[PDB]
Every structure is written in structure tokens, then in C-alpha cells.
């Protein structure tokens, strides 16, 4: 089937579904997925005791 309108329409719908959680997270719980340890400027002499990768 032609990509348009079948998947162009499906894709737009898909985008809007991903968009909600992404924006909900972004607007409501901004640092949810982020480490709070990174609000402390780099200190070349001290590695945080609790250091985990993204």
C-alpha cells in the first residue's frame, strides 16, 4: 500500500502517543530520569561515593 496516507497517518498517530509521556515527563517530572548528583559542579578531586551511569 502507498506509504501515504496509510503510514503517514499511522506514524503521526504514533508520534502523538510517544509525545504525551515524553512531555508529561518533561513538564511534570523534569529530572525523573536524571541523576541529581550532576547539579554539583565537577570536582576533579572528588568522585561522588554514589556514581552511576545514565
Amino acid at each position: 500500500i502507498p506509504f501515504h496516507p496509510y503510514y503517514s497517518f499511522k506514524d503521526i498517530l504514533g508520534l502523538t502517543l510517544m509525545l504525551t509521556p515524553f512531555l508529561t515527563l518533561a513538564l511534570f517530572s523534569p529530572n525523573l530520569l536524571g541523576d541529581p548528583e550532576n547539579f554539583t559542579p565537577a570536582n576533579p578531586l572528588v568522585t561522588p561515593p554514589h556514581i552511576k551511569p545514565e
Partner: protein
């Protein structure tokens, strides 16, 4: 002696009705030869699911002899007077007519009457014709154009009676009973619904006296005098794709519900179909043809042919086009076609309608090129339009049409409408109803 005048000179078509309901009409010419026939208002649309194919099976017997004059008796009598008998059966109109010497005008009417009324229906012949019709189906099935229009109706009028073929089902043909053919005749071939028409060197009066004589149907109750009104057929934006990559070319037909005989717009619709016209690989015109679609078709080898059409019916109709192409140019062709349709609704030019109107009048005239065609117009006019419509009138109506009118009317019936589609053959390239549905707007 300007055209205008030759029109208002053509003798008027006379019509007289009998007490039974039969309507006799004719156009008298000096012609030594002539044509007379009975145009019944019956067809496959009147048939229901159990007898689909009766009117066609019956068509195959109205010539194999009557009660009075059996097979040879009939044929002999007719062949020997140098007359040609023949007819047809559409979805909602059936006809039987003869081509004989104006001299035999009255004996023919007798013969016509004897056919519509006393068909022998020899149960022996029936079983033979059964095998014949079955055979003609095998053949007609190889006529893409037919297959394609039947299918067109099959889906455009899906669920209704208009979605049936005239020839009927393979089962009905295999099982219809003498009795079925019998009642079909009794129920439909009835005076108030038939029309005895004639054209040529014939006296209308002589014609009607002969009518009185053999077309002496009797009517006691009101029921008999009444003409039934068929149930309305529902149009449906849909499509049916019968694919077979083994056929050489592919057929495609697209259409929208048309108004119906009665509606004046039809004139405008015809003028429009007159612009887009029709084409075919043997049209000398070539790249210079006036119809853009045709021209485009030629410049891009888009199709072996295409043709517009406005098939009218009592209450409905089909306004569309059909084209035959190669598997790989179906899309470009469809594209261009809808293109012109959209152009019809949005930008028809006065110059176009001018040409269109002329071309139309010319076709209108060719519709009356002989006693038979003329006759066919009478039988049908009365049957459809109720009365007769003179070229002087048609011509009048046609002249009223102008660009603006074409656009308005076409927009009215085309723009943003869900079309009916039928495609047959190696149709992989043409595709998606949606993509086609969007071709219905802006253009």
C-alpha cells in the same frame, strides 16, 4: 436552408393511447422501408433474486415461435417477407422490433403482438436455449468491457437490484422453469408498460388501427392499469478489484451516481462528457485531438482507449469513464483522468463548452440515422421521458448550457464524492481507494 429550420421541419411524433394502456407512437417519413417494435418497460432490474435472468431467457424464446405459428411457421413467414426481427434486454428496458417494407407495416404489428402475447415457450426449446445462454455467458465473460461494467454496477449498486447482470446467474439459467418464464411474461409484458413505436413510410392512423386489432388487451381492475414504482437502488462509494495478471491489458471504470432520465442536468452532464470525450489508438486526430485527456493519452501512451459515459436510469444512474491500459500506465492514466474531471468542476472554459455543444448536437443527430434508431428513440423517450423530445427541443436545452453551468453541475455530481470503482486484469499499479478518493477534490 439553415440547420435551425431543418429541425423545426422534421415531422412531429404522434402518440395515441389505447383503453388497455398501450401507447402507440410514430414518426412518419416517406421511407419505402421502415421499423416497428414494442419497447417494454421491463428488464433485469424488475427481476428479483430467484428469477434473475428471466427477461433474457425469455428474449431467447420470443423468436422461436408463438402458439399460433410454431418455429418454422414463424421464421418462414418472417424470413420470406424480407424482414429482420431482433431485439434486446437491458437492466430496466426490453425491446422487440422488426425492419420491414412500409407495405407490411400492419402484418408486422400482428406479428409483434403475437410474440409479446402468445410466446409458445415450447418446453423442448427451453432446455436447448438453456444450454445456449450458458454458452453465451462463457463468451461474454471474455469481454473485459462487459465484465467491467457489470462489476461496476455490482459494486456501485451493491445490495440492490441494479447490481445484477441482465444475463443472470449460472444457477438461475440452469434452473429457471417454463413457469418462471411464463409469469415473467405475464407480470411484466403489460399494455400500460409497453410502447408500440414505428418510423418510416407509415400512417400513424393505419398504425394505431392495427394496434387496436391485435394489441387488444383487456383491463378490469385498477391494479392492471397501474405501472409499479421500483424500489430505489442505493449507490455506494466502493470498489471491486478483480485481478488477473494474465490478461494483456487492464480495464478501469470509475463513476458517481447520476440523477436519472427526468433530470435536466443530464443535458449539462452530456455536454461535459462531450469535453473530455473519448479516445482510442486508431483516432487519426493524434496529438492534436481536442480532448486534453485524449491528447495526454497520446503524448504519454496512457491507454489503448478511454471513454466517458452518463448511463441514465429511472431514479438513478452512473456518470463516469472507462479506460483500457497497459499494466504500467494505469496510474498515470487514472491520474490524468481525474485531473480532467477536477478541471471540469473548477475551470471549464466557454470555448470548451462551445465545442462540446456542437459535438453533442452531432451525436444527437446520429441518434436518428434511420428508421430503427429513430424508432428506438421514440420507444425509449415515451418509456423514459414520458413523451417525445424533439431535436429542436434538445438543441434548445443544449444551447442554454455554458461553462458556469457545466462547472456547477459537475461540481454538484463529482466534487468530493465517493466514487464507484471496478478494475480488471493486471491492475497492481493502479491502487488504493483512498488515493483515488482524494483525486475527487481540488483541481
Amino acid at each position: 436552408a439553415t440547420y435551425a429550420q431543418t429541425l423545426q421541419n422534421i415531422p412531429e411524433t404522434n402518440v395515441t393511447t389505447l383503453d388497455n394502456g398501450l401507447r402507440v407512437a410514430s414518426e412518419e417519413s416517406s421511407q419505402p422501408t421502415c421499423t416497428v417494435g414494442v419497447w417494454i418497460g421491463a428488464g433485469s432490474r424488475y427481476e428479483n433474486e430467484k428469477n434473475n435472468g428471466a427477461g433474457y431467457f425469455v428474449e431467447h424464446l420470443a423468436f422461436k415461435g408463438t402458439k399460433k405459428r410454431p418455429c418454422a411457421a414463424f421464421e418462414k413467414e418472417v424470413e420470406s417477407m424480407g424482414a429482420h426481427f431482433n431485439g434486446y434486454t437491458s437492466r430496466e428496458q426490453t425491446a422487440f422490433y422488426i425492419k420491414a417494407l412500409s407495405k407490411d407495416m400492419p402484418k408486422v404489428v400482428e406479428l409483434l403482438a403475437d410474440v409479446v402475447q402468445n410466446c409458445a415457450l415450447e418446453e423442448s426449446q427451453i432446455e436447448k436455449e438453456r444450454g445456449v445462454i450458458l454458452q453465451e455467458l462463457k463468451e461474454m465473460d471474455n469481454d473485459m468491457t462487459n465484465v467491467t461494467f457489470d462489476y461496476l454496477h455490482a459494486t456501485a449498486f451493491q445490495g440492490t437490484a441494479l447490481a445484477r447482470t441482465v444475463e443472470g446467474t449460472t444457477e438461475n439459467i440452469k434452473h429457471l422453469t417454463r413457469a418462471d418464464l411464463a409469469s415473467y411474461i405475464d407480470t411484466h409484458f403489460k399494455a400500460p408498460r409497453m410502447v408500440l413505436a414505428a418510423a418510416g413510410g407509415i400512417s400513424h392512423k393505419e398504425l394505431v388501427d392495427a394496434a387496436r386489432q391485435h394489441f387488444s388487451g383487456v383491463s378490469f381492475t385498477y391494479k392492471e392499469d397501474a405501472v409499479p414504482i421500483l424500489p430505489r437502488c442505493r449507490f455506494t462509494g466502493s470498489e471491486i478489484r478483480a485481478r488477473d495478471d494474465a490478461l494483456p491489458v487492464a480495464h478501469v471504470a470509475l463513476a458517481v451516481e447520476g440523477p436519472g432520465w427526468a433530470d435536466p442536468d443530464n443535458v449539462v452532464l452530456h455536454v461535459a462528457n462531450a469535453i473530455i470525450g473519448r479516445y482510442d489508438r486508431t483516432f487519426g486526430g493524434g496529438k492534436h485531438l481536442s480532448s486534453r485527456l485524449a491528447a495526454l493519452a497520446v503524448e504519454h501512451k496512457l491507454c489503448h482507449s478511454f471513454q466517458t459515459f452518463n448511463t441514465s436510469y429511472s431514479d438513478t444512474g452512473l456518470f463516469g469513464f472507462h479506460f483500457v491500459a497497459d499494466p504500467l500506465s494505469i496510474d498515470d492514466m487514472m491520474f490524468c483522468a481525474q485531473g480532467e474531471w477536477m478541471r471540469l468542476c473548477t475551470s471549464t472554459t466557454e470555448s470548451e463548452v462551445k465545442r462540446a455543444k456542437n459535438h453533442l448536437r452531432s451525436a444527437m443527430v446520429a441518434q436518428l440515422d434511420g428508421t430503427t434508431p429513430v424508432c428506438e428513440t421514440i420507444g425509449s423517450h415515451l418509456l423514459n421521458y414520458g413523451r417525445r423530445i424533439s431535436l429542436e427541443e434538445w438543441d434548445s436545452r443544449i444551447s442554454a448550457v455554458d461553462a458556469r453551468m457545466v462547472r456547477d453541475v459537475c461540481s454538484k455530481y463529482i466534487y468530493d464524492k465517493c466514487p464507484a470503482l471496478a478494475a480488471v486484469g493486471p491492475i497492481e499499479q493502479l491502487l488504493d481507494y483512498n488515493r483515488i478518493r482524494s483525486g475527487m477534490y481540488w483541481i
